[PDB]
Amino acid sequence: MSHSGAAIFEKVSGIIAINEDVSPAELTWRSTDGDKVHTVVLSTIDKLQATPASSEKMMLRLIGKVKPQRHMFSFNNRTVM
Amino acid sequence: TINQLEEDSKILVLRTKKDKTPRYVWYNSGGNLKCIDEEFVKMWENVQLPQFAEL
Amino acid sequence: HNGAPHHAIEEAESLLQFHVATYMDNDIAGQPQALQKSGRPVKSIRARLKGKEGRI
Amino acid sequence: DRPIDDIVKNLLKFVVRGFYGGSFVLVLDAILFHSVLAEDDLKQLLSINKTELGPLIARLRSDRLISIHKQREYPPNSKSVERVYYYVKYPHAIDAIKWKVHQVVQRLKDDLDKNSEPNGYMCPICLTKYTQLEAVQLLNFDRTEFLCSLCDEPLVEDDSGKKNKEKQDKLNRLMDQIQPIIDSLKKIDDSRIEENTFEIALARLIPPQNQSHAAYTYNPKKGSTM
Amino acid sequence: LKRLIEYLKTRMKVLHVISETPKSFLQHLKQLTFIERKPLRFCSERLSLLVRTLEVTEVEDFTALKDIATFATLISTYEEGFLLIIEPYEIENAAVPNPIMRFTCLDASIAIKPVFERFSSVIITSGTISPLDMYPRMLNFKTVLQKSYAMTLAKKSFLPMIITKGSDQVAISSRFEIRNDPSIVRNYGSMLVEFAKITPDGMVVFFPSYLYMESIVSMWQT
Amino acid sequence: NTQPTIRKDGLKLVGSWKKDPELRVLSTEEILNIFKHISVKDFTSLGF
Amino acid sequence: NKDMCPICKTDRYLSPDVKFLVNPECYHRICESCVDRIFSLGPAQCPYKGCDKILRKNKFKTQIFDDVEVEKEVDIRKRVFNVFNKTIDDFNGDLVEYNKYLEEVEDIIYKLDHGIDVAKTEEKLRTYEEL
Amino acid sequence: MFFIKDLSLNITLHPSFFGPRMKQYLKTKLLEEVEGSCTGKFGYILCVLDYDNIDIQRGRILPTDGSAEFNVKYRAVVFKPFKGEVVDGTVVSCSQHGFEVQVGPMKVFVTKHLMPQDLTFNAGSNPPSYQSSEDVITIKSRIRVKIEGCISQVSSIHAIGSIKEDYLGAI
Ligand SMILES: [Zn+2]
Ligand SMILES: [Zn+2]
Ligand SMILES: [Zn+2]
């Protein structure tokens, strides 16, 4: 349950799962209607960004390494983040 | 085939009030569709329930 | 029973409440009066009670 | 996830196949599958009409099965509308099912109690019922028949009391069909029920489609003292 | 024996402590069933004879028969110096009630009485028994002489101490209600660490109860 | 809890809760439930 | 059943209030409400499919022992021992004849319990209680 | 069944009976409409005791019809039935609906659903009665009946009887 959560990826609803068993691990994003699928490689991770709980705007961002690749992750529940 | 799946209570089916024709099918995840008789259903319909704080 | 938008429910119960009131008192301040087919106001029970030709 | 959640889901499914029709089954299965749903999402999933969901939402609100949430959010185009959200309160739902089944069995036990009373009498002209007590005062000078007061016609025997075995068969045929509900409530009482809400039921949401007009983020307000 | 089992099963359904003499129990027996003391006084003998004469290959399922025959004979033959304790919570930490019965021997001199009756010359000896006259009180027997010896030393071979307070002079106690006191447990840990720093070869450490070690070593390991 | 100010607007009662105003129409069934929850001594003091 | 009635079929979950009322004649568990319903108007048969013995309302009692055959033995030895009142002093200290009498009364309890020689033992019981 | 009670009765004394001797007129007019009179408040009142002295108050002249209104307090024996009561009696009439048993001044009806199933109706026999395999219940026959329900109007009392209970019926 800690590795699973519904998310938003470029204004598109989806889910987030951790492909932890394979080395390297992956953050797989799956569209709920089967439009597109996205995965995140864990080797190119530098900084990881979060919003505070007091803020109503709810956003998660990932900073990569070599023009870094920045991905948006909007969630629904706070315990999920 | 949808009719026999309905009478076996394996799928959930939507039919018109005009006639018994299927368009949309769902899966019967729970128990049997016809498990309570009509008289028991209607006297379940007759009975009411108390308000919030009583329970 | 048949399901309705909420404002239909408040509209219907307000109509019922108004009919109860004008049955019980047709002369209400700030309120319209129920009228007969001839257009005369409906003689409520309070009208039959109070007044010169009232009950008392 | 939680086994108790599976037990209450199975209980809600069993009662909706039992005491409800197919469309109520579809609505409750949509609620138990997608934990938090709105009106537009339900219309998209079920292809149901407003005049068709009206009886459905009215019945599951009258039977206290679906908790409704009155929340208005602000879309970026500033066309804010009062959207409604449908979720379930597990302890309230199981208490409602408990009270309904208890009052059902109490009513049918009272029916079995009152059907042991004798047949009584009834006048076919006036169509008025008579118990055993007032049949004696309607007895004539011939000491044979019971003459009606208004119709002046002899009374006939009502067909009540011979259905006492029919009521017993109805009682047993109801109770062998309710035993899984009894077992589910026993398993619930042997466990603990966590009282959820909209913010808690949003933890286990399943998205109906990609593009839902109704947002699932709660907007707090200051100064509301409801 | 089956109605013995059912009578005792009936006797467990109670919500409070039952503390009655064997005489009261047998009177309740004789008024609830029709079963006398004398047939119960041959219960174990009859059951053993029946099991022998049946020549059963396995006796795994008949051990509770030994239990009930033992109970019947014990509570029938004995009426003074004994008591029956029926209590509903065999452990008070259990969520579900588990009723218990305890048939106890109030008089400890009973089991030692035929030993004194049969034999003449008896030596009672412990390395650490005190007081010497305590035991002729708990056991109905008369000694011919009791004396305690003071063992003499060229140099004092043993050094006994009493510690009443920790390093911070906080009084230490091992009452079961204050077993979770962080100050007392911390003082205990401090003295045992210092002793382990200063003890050459080996220690034995004694506490009152098993749950006491469980809680207190859970706390020091934490 | 915060008891709102009640005023009549025709044949219905509206209650304005204070702002830390939250104004809404009070349903008759709600008032009936509240009046049922009023104890005997409470309306006895009120003259009922 | 173990928890719930056979006629009204009320569990202890939903109706914890009725009591373990059992026949001393046909030995069937039934709730208190079924006794107050069926047998208040008059005596009737056993309400199940298979037993139909005529039983009274006032003959119903609570169940002390949860077993049925044991309770049957209990009630028949109350029904027998009330007239079978012979002690050691009644035998004037004769142990052998007292033991034989105890064996005899135990045997007739067994015969009424299994219901095999019920007629002859019942006849002997009535002839003994008449004297 | 039979009780004794201290009752107060309100009597309309007509002005035509304002003779010198109203006491025995008042006692007499007490004594027609009480003896055998049925009241649901106290049952069938049968006989008035203590006739020599009866408490007679000072009478009310009603302001419209001039009649004297006396609140006479008297002591009398009454027959007030109840439900759950078993009594003896004799059958005075019978029918397919059931039979009427006379208990005192009262005709308690036993309905056709309230005998044991052994009894059945035979209208061919004269008189038409209820016959069973072990006993017959005819007119003017001794029978013990239990009353399960009594309805009491302002001036009439009717009762429901049965013989389904054990140790009932003919003695
Ligand atoms: Zn009529
Ligand atoms: Zn029952
Ligand atoms: Zn039976």
Can you read off the two tokens belonging to residue G5? 């009635």
Which of D62, D221, D225, D226 best tests the F interface by mutation, with the highest count of F CBs <10 A? Answer: D225
- Interface size, chain C vs chain D, as Cβ–Cβ contacts under 8 Å: 14
Determined by cryo-EM
Q: CA-CA distance, G91 to G87, in Å (whole number)?
A: 6
Query: Smallest Cα–Cα separation from H145: which of H112, H109, H121, H120?
Result: H109
| CA-to-CA separations, H81 to C25, G30, H78, H86, H107, in angstroms, rounded | 52, 35, 10, 10, 11
What is the extent of the structural domain holding A14? Answer: 4-81
Sign of CA dihedral C13, C15, C21, C27: positive
Residue of G nearest to E1 (CA): G70
* CA atoms of G12 and G4, how far apart (whole Å): 6
Strand partners, H150: H159
Could you report how far apart the first and last alpha carbons of chain C are, in Å?
Answer: 43
Which residues neighbour E183 within 8 Å (Cβ) at sequence distance 6 or greater? E166, E168, E170
**What is the span of the domain harbouring residue G37?**
4-59
Phi-psi category of residue D157: left, alpha or beta, with phi > 0 → left and psi -120 to 50 → alpha:
beta
CB H165 within 8 A of CB H145: no
Residue A14 to residue D206: CA distance in whole angstroms: 9
The domain that contains G15 carries what CATH number?
3.30.40.10
**G/C touch flag: 3 or more CB pairs below 8 Å:** no
Q: Total domain count for chain A?
A: 1
Measured at the alpha carbon of residue A78, what is the angle toward residues A72 and A81, in degrees to the nearest 5? 50
Question: Does the distance separating the beta carbons of D14 and B55 come in below 8 Å?
Answer: no
Per-residue burial over C8-26, b = 16 or more CB atoms within 10 Å of its CB, e = otherwise: eeeeeeeeeebeebbeeeb
D4 touches B at CB < 8 Å: no
Cα of D184 from ligand 3 centre, angstroms? 31
Contact H164 G56 (CB under 8 A): no
Distance CA B12, CA D17 (A): 10
Beta strands G21-22 and A37-41 are: unpaired
Question: How far, in Å, is the centroid of ligand 2 from the Cα of G37?
Answer: 9
* Residues across chain H: 171
- How far does the CA of residue D126 sit from the closest CA of chain C (Å)? 33
Instruction: Identify the CATH number of the domain in which residue A15 sits.
Output: 2.30.29.30
Is D226 in the F-facing interface, judged by CB distances under 8 Å?
A: yes
Q: Are B36 and D175 in contact (CB under 8 A)?
A: no
D174 part of contact set with chain B, CB < 8 Å = yes
For ligand 3, the distance from its centroid to the CA atom of residue G27, given in whole angstroms, is 6
- Cα–Cα dist C21/C28, whole Å: 8
Report CB contact under 8 Å: G10, D182: no
H residues 147-166 closer than 8 Å to D (CB): 149-151, 153, 156, 158-160
Judge: B40–D177 Cβ closer than 8 Å, yes or no: yes
Asked if G42's CB is within 8 angstroms of H165's CB, the reply is yes
**Side chain identity at residue H82, one-letter code:** F
Which tokens belong to D167?
A: 């009521």
Q: Which residues contact D83 (CB under 8 A, 6 or more apart)?
A: D38, D39, D40, D71, D72, D73, D213, D214
According to DSSP, the β-strands at H120-122 and H129-131 are: antiparallel
Three-point CA angle F33, F34, F40, nearest 5°: 110
- Residue H164's contacts (CB-CB under 8 Å, 6 or more residues apart) are G41, G42, H114, H115, H116
Q: Which residues of H touch G43 (CB under 8 A)?
A: 166
Chain B interface includes D63 (CB < 8 A)? yes
Alpha helices, DSSP H, located in chain C: 6-24, 45-49
Name every residue in C having a CB less than 8 A away from some CB of F: 10, 13-14, 17-18, 21, 28, 30-31
Q: Chain D: nearest CA to H160, how far in angstroms?
A: 7
Calculate how far, in angstroms, residue H91's C-alpha sits from the geometric centre of ligand 1: 29
In degrees rounded to 5, what are phi and psi of residue D186?
-65, -45
**What residues of C are in contact with residue D53 (Cβ under 8 Å)?**
3
List chains adjacent to chain F, taking adjacency as at least 3 C-beta pairs closer than 8 Å: C, D
**Under a CB-based contact definition with an 8 Å cutoff, are residues E192 and E205 in contact?**
yes
β pairing state of H68-79 and H106-111: unpaired
Cα–ligand 1 centroid distance for D150 (angstroms): 5
Other Cβ atoms closer than 10 A to H27: 16
Give me ligand 3 centre to Cα G106, in Å: 26
Partner-chain residue, chosen from E6, E32, E34, that has the shortest CB–CB distance to G70: E6
